[PDB]
Amino acid sequence: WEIPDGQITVGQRIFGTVYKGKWHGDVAVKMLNVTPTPQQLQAFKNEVGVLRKTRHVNILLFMGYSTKPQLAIVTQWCEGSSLYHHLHASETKFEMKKLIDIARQTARGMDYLHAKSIIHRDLKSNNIFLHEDNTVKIGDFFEQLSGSILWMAPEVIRMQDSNPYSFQSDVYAFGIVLYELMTGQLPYSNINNRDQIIEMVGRGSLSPDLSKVRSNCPKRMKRLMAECLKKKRDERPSFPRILAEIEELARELS
Amino acid sequence: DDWEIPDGQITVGQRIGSFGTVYKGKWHGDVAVKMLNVPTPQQLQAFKNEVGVLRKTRHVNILLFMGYSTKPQLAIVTQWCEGSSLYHHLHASETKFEMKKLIDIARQTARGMDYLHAKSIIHRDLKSNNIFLHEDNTVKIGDFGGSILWMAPEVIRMQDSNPYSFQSDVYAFGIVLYELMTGQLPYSNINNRDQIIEMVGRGSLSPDLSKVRSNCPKRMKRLMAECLKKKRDERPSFPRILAEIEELAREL
Numbered sequence A: 001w002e003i004p005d006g007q008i009t010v011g012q013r014i015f016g017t018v019y020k021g022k023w024h025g026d027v028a029v030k031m032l033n034v035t036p037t038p039q040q041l042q043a044f045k046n047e048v049g050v051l052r053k054t055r056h057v058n059i060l061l062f063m064g065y066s067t068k069p070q071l072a073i074v075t076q077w078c079e080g081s082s083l084y085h086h087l088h089a090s091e092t093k094f095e096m097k098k099l100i101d102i103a104r105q106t107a108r109g110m111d112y113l114h115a116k117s118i119i120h121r122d123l124k125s126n127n128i129f130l131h132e133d134n135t136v137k138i139g140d141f142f143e144q145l146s147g148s149i150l151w152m153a154p155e156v157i158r159m160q161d162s163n164p165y166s167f168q169s170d171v172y173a174f175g176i177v178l179y180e181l182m183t184g185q186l187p188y189s190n191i192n193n194r195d196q197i198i199e200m201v202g203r204g205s206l207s208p209d210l211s212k213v214r215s216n217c218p219k220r221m222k223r224l225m226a227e228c229l230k231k232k233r234d235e236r237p238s239f240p241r242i243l244a245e246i247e248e249l250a251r252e253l254s
Numbered sequence B: 001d002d003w004e005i006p007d008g009q010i011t012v013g014q015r016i017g018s019f020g021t022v023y024k025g026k027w028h029g030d031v032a033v034k035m036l037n038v039p040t041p042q043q044l045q046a047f048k049n050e051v052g053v054l055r056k057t058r059h060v061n062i063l064l065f066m067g068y069s070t071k072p073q074l075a076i077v078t079q080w081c082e083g084s085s086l087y088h089h090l091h092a093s094e095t096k097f098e099m100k101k102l103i104d105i106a107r108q109t110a111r112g113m114d115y116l117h118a119k120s121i122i123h124r125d126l127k128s129n130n131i132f133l134h135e136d137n138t139v140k141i142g143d144f145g146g147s148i149l150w151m152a153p154e155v156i157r158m159q160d161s162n163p164y165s166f167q168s169d170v171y172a173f174g175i176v177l178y179e180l181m182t183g184q185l186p187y188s189n190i191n192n193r194d195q196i197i198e199m200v201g202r203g204s205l206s207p208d209l210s211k212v213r214s215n216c217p218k219r220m221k222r223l224m225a226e227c228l229k230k231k232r233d234e235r236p237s238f239p240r241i242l243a244e245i246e247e248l249a250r251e252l
């Protein structure tokens, strides 16, 4: 899928540098300013290999990768903004039907990812793009420092090996996104302190209150959302059941 | 080779077409499954090669191939799009489309065809019925999937022609432009299959450009006529067509 250098035309810039380019129509190319790094080259190869096996309407359409001018990924161009900008920044009055439709499409995309054992580690409402309208597209998804291995303390050695991301973190992020959709605001809106939220969520003391959900939201949706926010990882359900429940609730509520 | 959807995962539904029988199925959301009346290894290798041809297509304006199934029946599974075919919009429904929407549909089809030809892919059955309008303004294109020594010089010449090429595709694109601008199928007066076949084969008949809408620009009609050249070599290449269409869209 390597696109030659001369074929790709660069355009306006809108981590990593993103630019809206023109290549057989509108595309978006993300390149990193480097002149690169072999470690970054291996990471780019792994990211390209992960992105190549993805074909779904609700997943962003990867179109190619370029390596000659700068290590870069070229995908389709979609008109609109992120769900974070729609709900939080503009506070657009979204009908409950549009909310449950966005939820169903996000669930389709996540079920597709998990069916391929692909782990979207940074799933958030800011990485959920709304092409046109009511069309969801998802994107923006080992001690390398070999020399300083001996001098680091057991505090930092143990931290580098940790691998917390799994399907359960993804379903928790999906539940938080459902909270954003239904309430219309970021969770823990009162607590404007990062450290407090981090500590209270790490100790499981704080969870987003489902009481602030909009009155138009059905009860089954809130039940599924609360089920996805289980503190214990194993209690959280798998995404096929989530998609089935969302589709059933949408069919019931027309 | 690694895109086969296993059996039982795909749930079939109502038939929405009957090249191949089309059905709206459910597999990680709404999908569309096209099935073939055919299980033989010789045919299986050809199906695998066709799948490999379909795998090198990733474009917003090209229909999204999502997988192939061989266990219950040999079938191709792609995305599901809400809407109808451009043929249904213009001819069957006669939806009042603004000239901006028409030139945008033309630009999207041109992007898709230029991408296909850039991959050295020859869409042999290009027609306005294979252009689906997802939502109501997103174009999706699909339906594009020896005894030589013993043959006499009379019959050998027929094999050497190879009539399908990029020029046939740009001719079909010109016919699609005619449908877009006029709003009706070409040769509406004749309505005879054999007569039209003969007269177009001898180059005696061309779609009458007088029935074109008044709103259509002159550059668009010029490009359309350039794509309908009887001689294959006179027809322009799709990159130049895409550039001209983009410039005309920016101007208007």
Ligand SMILES: CCCS(=O)(=O)Nc1ccc(F)c(-n2cc(-c3cncnc3)c3nc(N(C)C4CCN(C(C)=O)CC4)ccc32)c1F
Pocket: B016, B017, B018, B022, B032, B033, B034, B054, B063, B064, B065, B076, B077, B078, B079, B080, B081, B082, B084, B085, B088, B092, B129, B132, B141, B142, B143, B144, B145
């Ligand atoms: C992607 C690689 C290219 S491919 O060469 O491999 N070919 C291929 C492979 C697999 C496929 F499923 C379809 N295919 C999908 C829909 C589809 C339908 N509805 C929503 N989304 C998609 C569809 N519709 C079709 N017809 C009959 C039209 C005609 C008129 N209509 C009216 C009057 O209403 C509606 C529909 C025909 C084929 C269709 C393929 F073209």
